Amino acid sequence: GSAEQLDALVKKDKVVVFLKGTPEQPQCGFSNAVVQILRLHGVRDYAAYNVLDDPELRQGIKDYSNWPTIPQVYLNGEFVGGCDILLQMHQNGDLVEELKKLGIHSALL
Template sequence: MDEKTIALEKIKKTVTENPVVLYMKGTPQFPQCGFSGRAAQVLKGCGVEKFVAVNVLEDQGAYEYLKFYADFPTFPQCYIGGELVGGSDIMLDLYQQGELQKLIAAAGR
């Protein structure tokens, strides 16, 4: 298997086996961009204390190939219940409408 196939399979496994996954620049404790920090804070605002956070600055496969997985070119990317929700702006909008909380509840968090 080539590098792209391996990376895409790893991404698929991560997003399908975990209720909430955030691909971000940095970590929730030490975000490396404002958008990633805001996305992590939105999840915490929904009461999600534990979620899988993948630092794309340290995971080259995720950084290079995640854009092909969901045809979404920017970071952060939030997946809930195996589905792409979007980046920090979309997450914040859904949170303010009360919809993000429903998605998280439906995913079992």
């Protein structure tokens, strides 16, 4: 929930996502689109947090990022966007480069 607690969370790992549901079982198409894109580039090692489990987290990640919706994508402790931005980076090669920057070899390469 907290601002200090979320700052830790996003910096904790290279690729961090906030979803409705889980990678195994997403509860929302927008959250799912993110899970599938990560699957396509072969990113198996990322942090996923379920906002349905905690209303304080649901509300807290919005306040932290200044972003009104879920899913939220962080690369390198920095906010990237939601599923629309992510699909866009998937289609124009930008995500492959962002992944390369984190030391992550994308499967589409």
